[PDB]
Ligand binder design. Structure first.
Ligand SMILES: Nc1nc2c(ncn2[C@@H]2O[C@H](COP(=O)(O)OP(=O)(O)NP(=O)(O)O)[C@@H](O)[C@H]2O)c(=O)[nH]1
Ligand SMILES: [Mg+2]
Length: 177
């Protein structure tokens, strides 16, 4: 790790079934599992990437969307530097519930510079319920980055993680050791 600038804690949150774990598997393993199992507790994965000429090691916390499967919730948020909030563009309920997730995240307000990225997933699917502009409006109202993605067809996945990391490195007090 002699060329690694820093290790960043990235949290992935959002309702069950929106594709959190699939976005992560696409990013770490370059594959998709149509039958991926629901996450129980937290699934931690490490991946190192390069953005703007710097290598950042990502410690990624993929959490269960079902509240009954979450434990030590304060631990999930503690130290997070980037947060990816995910909704399913085919399920309006998962988009409206992002307000509950944001309320939770805002109780872990030690710093006010954590970088948030909103991802509307499953854009490959039929029967979209949330349009892109609606997701963009929410992101901008909350000063978040925004991307639409498909873990299934790869659209937007790499950018969701790269754009988040680029911005975290450009917010110095956030990662300086
Ligand atoms: N068509 C399509 N299906 C997807 C996409 N992303 C995930 N899925 C599917 O949607 C289902 C749930 O995905 P998953 O990644 O497990 O969701 P999750 O947000 O991690 N759920 P949990 O919070 O319960 O762990 C899975 O069967 C998976 O194949 C996508 O971009 N497009
Ligand atoms: Mg999962």
């Amino acid at each position: 790790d002699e060329d690694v600038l820093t290790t960043l804690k990235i949290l992935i949150i959002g309702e069950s079934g929106v594709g959190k774990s699939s976005l992560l598997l696409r990013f770490t393993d370059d594959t998709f599992d149509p039958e991926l199992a629901a996450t129980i507790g937290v699934d931690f994965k490490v991946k190192t990437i390069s953005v703007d000429g710097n290598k950042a090691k990502l410690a990624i916390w993929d959490t269960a969307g079902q509240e009954r499967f979450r434990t030590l919730t304060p631990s999930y948020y503690r130290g997070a530097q980037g947060v990816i909030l995910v909704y399913d563009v085919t399920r309006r309920d998962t988009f409206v519930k992002l307000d509950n997730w944001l309320n939770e995240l805002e109780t872990y307000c030690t710093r006010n510079d954590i970088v948030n990225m909103l991802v509307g997933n499953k854009i490959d699917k039929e029967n979209r319920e949330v349009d892109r502009n609606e997701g963009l409006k929410f992101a901008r109202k909350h000063s978040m980055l925004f991307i639409e993605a498909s873990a299934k067809t790869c659209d937007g996945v790499q950018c969701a993680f790269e754009e988040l990391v680029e911005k975290i490195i450009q917010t110095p007090g956030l990662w300086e050791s």
